[PDB]
Amino acid sequence: SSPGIWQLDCTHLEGKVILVAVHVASGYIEAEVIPAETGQETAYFLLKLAGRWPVKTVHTDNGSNFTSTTVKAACWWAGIKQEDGIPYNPQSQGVIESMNKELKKIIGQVRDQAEHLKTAVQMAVFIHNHKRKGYSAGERIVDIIATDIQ
Amino acid sequence: SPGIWQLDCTHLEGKVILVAVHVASGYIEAEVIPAETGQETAYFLLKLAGRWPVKTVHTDNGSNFTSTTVKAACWWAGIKQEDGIPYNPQSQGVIESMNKELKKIIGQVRDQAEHLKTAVQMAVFIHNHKRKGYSAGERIVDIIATDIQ
């Protein structure tokens, strides 16, 4: 739960793959839709994330992305420590599952406003990150990193 | 102001790079698209406003200002869509200079990437991490955190 720690998470909907990065200390997320999880798609996603937030450590979502030399090359390029995603803390496992179920619920609530699933996913990222539960996740991430900069 | 962003559209390699700049910090997000359309612009803005507290966007030209798809995304995401008229002539200059900087960076990484979209994200990363002393990515976080408080 330090300011630079993120977790990758891969979930499926509509025959497609949604890749999510969660900032563990705040719950803030970024996500994209891809046709399948490949090391090239995961590597590109992490390059995007690391240009936008100070990403120090990523816990990868499975052993194939941990092994992937393309993912390791993006983590080398972007200065990221690539780690496994073993839930040595069993809470960690449960927190992901329940975020996937919340995101999927939100996606169902907006799904009919979008022709393409990628729109619906970005509307769900927007709702997730702005939801006050009290601060939002987007408020918590900014406060956490700003405190760290100071 | 903490919520104010400017869109900017530049061309390279027959493709289009759409950029959003956070005016007070110089921090940027960018993507490669085959051409600028109101549907691509709208989706890009939906992405941006889910990641940062986007209050106002100065659009990069009159077609995106007019586009009803862009206005529909700005409605959805709670964004005030404005024109991008440089009432302050400094605004023209700053954008031109950022396009020249980004293109320079992209040339410095271009051989490390097969696809232009990778080179553009490597350039976003270098731009946002560059210390000028704080980086743009540090400045944007400080500005918005100050505002949250």
Binding site: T70, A73 | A113
Partner: peptide
């Protein structure tokens, strides 16, 4: 191909 995004 010797690229970050295409190691081949």
């Amino acid at each position: 191909s010797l690229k970050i995004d295409n190691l081949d």
